[PDB]
Protein backbone atom coordinates (compact mmCIF):
# COMPACT_ATOMS: atom_id res chain seq x y z
CA UNK A 1 0.00 0.00 0.00
CA UNK A 2 0.99 3.61 0.39
CA UNK A 3 3.57 5.05 2.74
CA UNK A 4 1.69 6.76 5.62
CA UNK A 5 2.76 9.61 7.91
CA UNK A 6 2.26 8.30 11.46
CA UNK A 7 4.11 10.99 13.41
CA UNK A 8 6.49 13.86 13.12
CA UNK A 9 9.63 15.37 14.53
CA UNK A 10 9.72 19.12 15.10
CA UNK A 11 13.10 20.91 15.22
CA UNK A 12 13.76 23.94 17.44
CA UNK A 13 21.41 24.82 19.74
CA UNK A 14 19.49 22.15 17.82
CA UNK A 15 16.72 20.39 19.71
CA UNK A 16 13.89 18.13 18.63
CA UNK A 17 10.73 16.49 19.90
CA UNK A 18 8.39 13.90 18.38
CA UNK A 19 4.59 13.60 18.32
CA UNK A 20 2.58 10.59 17.29
CA UNK A 21 -0.27 11.27 14.85
CA UNK A 22 -1.60 7.81 13.85
CA UNK A 23 -2.25 4.51 15.51
CA UNK A 24 -1.50 1.12 14.03
CA UNK A 25 -5.01 0.41 12.74
CA UNK A 26 -5.47 3.84 11.10
CA UNK A 27 -2.02 3.40 9.60
CA UNK A 28 -2.95 0.06 7.94
CA UNK A 29 -6.29 1.46 6.67
CA UNK A 30 -4.73 4.68 5.38
CA UNK A 31 -2.11 2.54 3.57
CA UNK A 32 -4.88 0.74 1.64
CA UNK A 33 -6.92 3.81 0.76
CA UNK A 34 -3.98 6.17 0.12
CA UNK A 35 -6.12 8.92 1.62
CA UNK A 36 -4.72 10.91 4.55
CA UNK A 37 -6.74 13.90 5.82
CA UNK A 38 -4.55 14.75 8.85
CA UNK A 39 -2.70 18.07 9.11
CA UNK A 40 1.04 17.74 8.54
CA UNK A 41 3.57 19.67 10.66
CA UNK A 42 7.32 19.60 11.21
CA UNK A 43 10.47 19.03 9.17
CA UNK A 44 10.75 15.25 9.64
CA UNK A 45 7.89 12.79 9.22
CA UNK A 46 7.77 9.37 10.83
CA UNK A 47 6.40 7.18 8.04
CA UNK A 48 5.20 3.63 7.82
CA UNK A 49 4.02 0.96 5.44
CA UNK A 50 2.10 -2.14 6.55
CA UNK A 51 5.46 -3.83 7.17
CA UNK A 52 8.12 -1.26 8.11
CA UNK A 53 8.71 2.25 9.45
CA UNK A 54 11.35 4.91 8.98
CA UNK A 55 11.80 8.66 8.51
CA UNK A 56 11.31 11.19 5.72
CA UNK A 57 12.91 14.66 5.67
CA UNK A 58 11.48 17.67 3.80
CA UNK A 59 14.13 19.81 2.00
CA UNK A 60 13.12 22.58 -0.44
CA UNK A 61 9.49 21.46 -0.76
CA UNK A 62 10.28 17.77 -1.36
CA UNK A 63 9.83 15.03 1.22
CA UNK A 64 12.86 12.74 0.84
CA UNK A 65 13.45 9.27 2.11
CA UNK A 66 15.27 6.04 1.46
CA UNK A 67 14.44 3.71 -1.39
CA UNK A 68 15.02 0.63 0.85
CA UNK A 69 12.19 1.91 3.04
CA UNK A 70 9.65 3.36 0.59
CA UNK A 71 10.37 1.39 -2.62
CA UNK A 72 8.24 2.79 -5.47
CA UNK A 73 5.23 3.47 -3.23
CA UNK A 74 2.90 6.44 -3.26
CA UNK A 75 2.52 8.65 -0.15
CA UNK A 76 -0.97 8.87 1.35
CA UNK A 77 -2.28 12.44 1.03
CA UNK A 78 -5.38 14.69 1.34
CA UNK A 79 -6.42 14.21 -2.28
CA UNK A 80 -5.33 10.57 -2.44
CA UNK A 81 -2.00 8.80 -3.11
CA UNK A 82 0.91 11.03 -4.12
CA UNK A 83 3.22 9.60 -6.84
CA UNK A 84 6.98 9.89 -6.27
CA UNK A 85 8.38 12.99 -7.93
CA UNK A 86 11.92 11.50 -7.79
CA UNK A 87 12.97 7.85 -7.78
CA UNK A 88 16.77 7.25 -7.75
CA UNK A 89 17.36 3.58 -6.97
CA UNK A 90 21.17 3.73 -7.26
CA UNK A 91 21.49 6.55 -4.70
CA UNK A 92 18.79 4.82 -2.56
CA UNK A 93 16.72 8.03 -2.70
CA UNK A 94 13.05 8.81 -3.30
CA UNK A 95 11.03 12.01 -3.02
CA UNK A 96 7.41 13.16 -3.04
CA UNK A 97 6.18 16.70 -3.31
CA UNK A 98 5.96 17.81 0.33
CA UNK A 99 2.51 17.95 1.93
CA UNK A 100 1.41 21.53 2.59
CA UNK A 101 2.06 22.13 6.27
CA UNK A 102 5.39 20.29 6.25
CA UNK A 103 8.18 22.73 7.05
CA UNK A 104 11.11 22.50 4.61
CA UNK A 105 14.78 22.52 5.54
CA UNK A 106 17.08 24.51 3.29
CA UNK A 107 20.30 22.87 2.03
CA UNK A 108 23.53 23.62 3.89
CA UNK A 109 25.86 26.00 1.98
CA UNK A 110 28.40 26.60 4.80
CA UNK A 111 30.29 23.32 4.32
CA UNK A 112 30.68 22.68 8.07
CA UNK A 113 31.96 19.23 9.05
CA UNK A 114 30.34 19.56 12.51
CA UNK A 115 26.99 17.85 12.11
CA UNK A 116 23.98 16.63 14.03
CA UNK A 117 21.92 13.54 13.26
CA UNK A 118 18.29 13.62 14.40
CA UNK A 119 17.10 10.16 15.30
CA UNK A 120 13.65 8.55 15.35
CA UNK A 121 13.55 9.16 19.13
CA UNK A 122 14.11 12.90 18.54
CA UNK A 123 17.62 12.76 19.98
CA UNK A 124 20.11 15.04 18.31
CA UNK A 125 23.55 13.40 18.21
CA UNK A 126 26.94 14.81 17.11
CA UNK A 127 28.47 13.58 13.87
CA UNK A 128 31.77 14.55 12.28
CA UNK A 129 31.66 14.56 8.47
CA UNK A 130 34.41 12.32 7.06
CA UNK A 131 33.79 12.72 3.32
CA UNK A 132 30.95 13.04 0.80
CA UNK A 133 28.64 10.43 2.28
CA UNK A 134 30.06 9.35 5.67
CA UNK A 135 30.21 10.78 9.17
CA UNK A 136 31.60 9.26 12.35
CA UNK A 137 29.46 9.13 15.46
CA UNK A 138 31.45 11.04 18.08
CA UNK A 139 29.75 8.95 20.69
CA UNK A 140 29.15 5.38 19.45
CA UNK A 141 25.71 3.99 20.27
CA UNK A 142 24.12 0.57 19.95
CA UNK A 143 22.64 0.15 16.47
CA UNK A 144 19.31 -0.51 18.23
CA UNK A 145 19.27 3.17 19.15
CA UNK A 146 19.29 4.12 15.43
CA UNK A 147 16.69 1.55 14.38
CA UNK A 148 13.79 3.24 12.62
CA UNK A 149 15.86 6.33 11.76
CA UNK A 150 16.66 5.62 8.08
CA UNK A 151 15.74 8.71 6.05
CA UNK A 152 16.35 11.14 8.96
CA UNK A 153 18.28 14.37 8.55
CA UNK A 154 21.91 15.27 9.08
CA UNK A 155 22.08 18.95 9.95
CA UNK A 156 24.85 21.52 10.12
CA UNK A 157 25.17 23.86 13.13
CA UNK A 158 22.80 26.41 11.52
CA UNK A 159 20.10 23.73 11.16
CA UNK A 160 20.40 23.43 7.38
CA UNK A 161 20.27 20.07 5.57
CA UNK A 162 23.54 18.25 4.81
CA UNK A 163 22.12 14.84 3.98
CA UNK A 164 19.75 12.05 4.81
CA UNK A 165 20.73 9.06 6.91
CA UNK A 166 20.94 5.84 4.87
CA UNK A 167 22.78 3.13 6.81
CA UNK A 168 24.89 2.62 9.93
CA UNK A 169 28.47 1.33 9.83
CA UNK A 170 28.63 -1.19 12.65
CA UNK A 171 30.99 -3.54 14.48
CA UNK A 172 29.55 -5.96 17.05
CA UNK A 173 26.19 -4.13 17.26
CA UNK A 174 27.80 -0.73 17.89
CA UNK A 175 27.25 2.03 15.35
CA UNK A 176 30.51 3.90 14.80
CA UNK A 177 29.60 5.81 11.66
CA UNK A 178 26.71 6.69 9.43
CA UNK A 179 26.39 6.50 5.68
CA UNK A 180 24.22 9.26 4.18
CA UNK A 181 22.90 10.65 0.90
CA UNK A 182 24.41 14.16 0.51
CA UNK A 183 22.10 17.06 -0.22
CA UNK A 184 24.08 17.47 -3.50
CA UNK A 185 22.61 14.17 -4.77
CA UNK A 186 19.14 15.61 -4.17
CA UNK A 187 20.09 18.57 -6.38
CA UNK A 188 21.59 16.24 -9.03
CA UNK A 189 18.45 14.02 -8.83
CA UNK A 190 16.17 17.08 -9.32
CA UNK A 191 17.87 19.06 -12.13
Amino acid sequence: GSVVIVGRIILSPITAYSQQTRGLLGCIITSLTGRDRNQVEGEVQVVSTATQSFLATCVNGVCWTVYHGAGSKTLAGPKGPITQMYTNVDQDLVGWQAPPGARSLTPCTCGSSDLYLVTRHADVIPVRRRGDSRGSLLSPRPVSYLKGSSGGPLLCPSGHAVGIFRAAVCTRGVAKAVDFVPVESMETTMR
Binding site: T51, S53, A167, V169, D179
Partner: peptide, 17 residues
Protein backbone atom coordinates in the same frame (compact mmCIF):
# COMPACT_ATOMS: atom_id res chain seq x y z
CA UNK B 1 32.74 -2.27 9.82
CA UNK B 2 29.70 -3.31 7.76
CA UNK B 3 26.51 -1.56 6.59
CA UNK B 4 23.40 -2.10 8.69
CA UNK B 5 19.98 -0.89 7.52
CA UNK B 6 17.77 0.73 10.11
CA UNK B 7 14.16 -0.05 9.24
CA UNK B 8 11.87 -0.80 12.15
CA UNK B 9 8.54 -2.66 12.12
CA UNK B 10 5.25 -0.94 11.20
CA UNK B 11 3.67 1.93 13.11
CA UNK B 12 4.85 4.95 15.08
CA UNK B 13 5.95 2.72 17.99
CA UNK B 14 6.57 -0.71 16.48
CA UNK B 15 5.53 -3.77 18.53
CA UNK B 16 8.39 -6.15 19.51
CA UNK B 17 8.04 -9.58 21.10
Amino acid sequence: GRLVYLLDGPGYDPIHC
